[PDB]
Symmetry: C2
C-alpha cells in the first residue's frame, strides 16, 4: 500500500540524517587526530633533522620518553575509539520493519511487468539502474524461465559494462547467461556470436567452447 | 641511555607518524565514500518525501527502494563497522617492544632534576626552553611540570616537588590550557612546602586550594591542623 511505502521512505530519510550525524562525529574525531599528527610531524621532523642536538636538550629526553610511553597510548585510544554505535543501534532497530528477499524479488517482477505494460526499452528504464541491478533483474527472469526478460536485462547489463561503468560483475558471466537465454529464444546466430565474444574474453571457458561446436552443429542441421 | 638508542627511537617515531598519516588517508577515503553515498541517497529520499505516491509509482523507484533497504544498507553497515586502523595499530604494537617504559620515563625525569641542580637553573628557564647556545626550542607543559613535581614527590624529594609544582601552577596562572586542575597541584605543593617546614606558606596555599574548592575534605583537615599547630607554636 501507499502508506507502507510512505513509512518506509520516511524511515530511510531518518536513517540518512542519523548517518550524517555519524559522519559528522567521525570527521570531528579525524580532525582532532589530524591536528595531533601535525604536531607530532613537526616534532619528529625537528628531531630527525639533528638527533644529536635533539638529545642534547635536557628536556627532550624526558619529553621523548613521555611521548613514546604515554602520549602515543592516548593517541592509540583515540584512533580505536568507536564512533558508530548510535547509528548502528538505530539502523539495527529500523531493520525490524525492513523488507526481505521476497519483497525484493517481488518488487523486481513488478519492474518487469511494468516494462511490458508500457512498452519501454531497457536502456530508457536503466537511465538509475546499475550493471549489477540489470544482472539481478536478468537472474530474476532466469529463475522463472522468462528468457525474453533474461535476455533483455543481461543485454542491458552488458551494454553498461561496455560503456565502461565500474561494476562488480564481469562480462563473462553475463555473456554466459545472455547466450544461454538467446539460444533458448532460438536466435542461434546471435547465441553463436555471443559465445564467440565470451571465448574472446575467456578462451578456456568450458561450456562456451562446447557450445561453439554444438551451436555450429545444430545450425548445420537446421 | 645513549645517543644511538635515542636516534633509533626518534626514527621509529618518525615512521609511526608516517603510518598514522596513512591511517588518516584510509579513514578519509572511507568517510568520503560514505558521504557520497549518503549525498546521493539524500537526494533520492528528499525528492521521494515530496510526493511518495508519485515516487513509488515507478516499479523502478520501488525496486531500488526494496533493494537499498534489504541489501545495500547492510553493505553500508559493513563499511561503517570497517576498521581502517589495523595497519597503524599493528605497527605501533610491534614497535612498542623497543619503546621506553615507566622506569625509563621516571629515570629521564630524575635526570632532568639532577641537571637542574648541577647547572643551578630555575624552573622557568628550563620550562620555557629559552636557553643560550642551544638550537632546539622545546618546552615543558604545565602537565609536564606537574609530572616532574610528582616524580620528586615519589622520592620524598620535596625540594623539587615544591619547585616544579610552583612552575606548573604558574603556567596554569597564565591560563595555559591544560588537563590539570590547580587544586591537585595545590595539594601537592602545600604538602611539600609543609614537609620542608614553611607552615605559613603551606597554610596560605591550603587556603588557596579551599578558596578554589571549599568542600575539599583533606584540605579542610589540613587547615584545622595547621592553624592548631601554628597557634600552639
Amino acid at each position: 500500500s501507499i502508506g507502507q511505502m510512505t513509512d518506509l521512505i520516511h524511515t530511510e530519510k531518518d536513517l540518512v540524517t542519523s548517518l550524517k550525524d555519524y559522519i559528522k562525529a567521525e570527521e570531528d574525531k579525524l580532525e582532532q587526530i589530524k591536528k595531533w599528527a601535525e604536531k607530532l610531524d613537526r616534532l619528529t621532523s625537528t628531531a630527525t633533522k639533528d638527533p644529536e642536538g635533539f638529545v642534547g636538550h635536557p628536556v627532550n629526553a624526558f619529553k621523548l620518553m613521555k611521548r613514546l610511553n604515554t602520549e602515543w597510548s592516548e593517541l592509540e585510544n583515540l584512533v580505536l575509539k568507536d564512533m558508530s554505535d548510535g547509528f548502528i543501534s538505530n539502523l539495527t532497530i529500523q531493520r525490524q520493519y525492513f523488507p526481505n528477499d521476497e519483497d525484493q524479488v517481488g518488487a523486481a517482477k513488478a519492474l518487469l511487468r511494468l516494462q511490458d505494460t508500457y512498452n519501454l526499452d531497457t536502456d530508457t528504464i536503466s537511465k538509475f539502474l546499475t550493471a549489477e541491478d540489470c544482472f539481478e533483474l536478468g537472474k530474476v527472469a532466469y529463475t522463472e524461465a522468462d528468457y525474453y526478460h533474461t535476455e533483455l536485462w543481461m543485454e542491458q547489463a552488458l551494454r553498461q559494462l561496455d560503456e565502461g561503468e565500474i561494476s562488480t560483475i564481469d562480462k563473462v558471466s553475463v555473456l554466459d547467461y545472455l547466450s544461454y537465454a538467446v539460444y533458448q529464444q532460438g536466435d542461434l546466430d546471435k547465441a553463436l556470436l555471443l559465445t564467440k565474444k565470451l571465448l574472446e574474453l575467456d578462451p578456456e571457458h568450458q561450456r562456451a567452447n562446447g557450445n561453439l561446436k554444438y551451436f555450429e552443429y545444430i545450425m548445420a542441421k537446421e
